[PDB]
Design a protein around this motif. Structure first.
Motif, PDB file in Angstrom:
ATOM      1  N   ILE A  22      17.807   5.048  48.146  1.00  0.00           N
ATOM      2  CA  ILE A  22      18.499   5.713  47.047  1.00  0.00           C
ATOM      3  C   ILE A  22      18.944   7.119  47.456  1.00  0.00           C
ATOM      4  O   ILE A  22      20.007   7.592  47.046  1.00  0.00           O
ATOM      5  N   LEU A  43      17.748   8.812  38.681  1.00  0.00           N
ATOM      6  CA  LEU A  43      17.689   7.984  39.889  1.00  0.00           C
ATOM      7  C   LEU A  43      16.322   7.320  39.947  1.00  0.00           C
ATOM      8  O   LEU A  43      16.197   6.179  40.375  1.00  0.00           O
ATOM      9  N   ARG A  46      16.289   4.068  38.200  1.00  0.00           N
ATOM     10  CA  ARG A  46      16.935   2.995  38.980  1.00  0.00           C
ATOM     11  C   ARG A  46      16.003   2.517  40.087  1.00  0.00           C
ATOM     12  O   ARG A  46      16.014   1.345  40.457  1.00  0.00           O
ATOM     13  N   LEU A  47      15.167   3.424  40.572  1.00  0.00           N
ATOM     14  CA  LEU A  47      14.143   3.106  41.566  1.00  0.00           C
ATOM     15  C   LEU A  47      13.225   1.998  41.061  1.00  0.00           C
ATOM     16  O   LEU A  47      12.831   1.127  41.824  1.00  0.00           O
TER      17      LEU A  47
END
Length: 91
Positions: A22, A43, A46-47
């Motif tokens: 990422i 983020l 989304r991880l």
């Protein structure tokens, strides 16, 4: 870019890879926080999805705030190995 340069445990290495994917880096240490790499909370949400695709496991973002490093996320994952009912949803 922390200076502790701590070694990786088995889950922590997968999380380091998942962080790097990422963040666009060559490597992540188990002592590098997702935020210390310049990562943001958006983020980090989304991880969770990528960790689920690769390892089959989910972690709420609540725990991720207390677990900013791979070494933190791995022990937080391990807590789910205890017999616990995840909350249900309708069909």
């Amino acid at each position: 870019g922390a200076m502790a340069k701590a070694p990786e445990s088995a889950t922590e290495k997968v999380l380091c890879a998942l962080y790097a994917e990422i963040l666009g880096v060559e490597r992540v240490g188990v002592d590098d926080a997702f935020h210390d790499l310049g990562g943001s909370s958006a983020l980090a949400m989304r991880l969770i999805a990528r960790i689920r695709e690769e390892l089959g496991v989910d972690l709420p973002i609540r725990q991720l705030f207390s677990s900013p490093t791979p070494a933190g996320v791995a022990r937080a994952l391990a807590a789910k190995s205890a017999s616990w009912s995840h909350p249900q949803f309708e069909k």
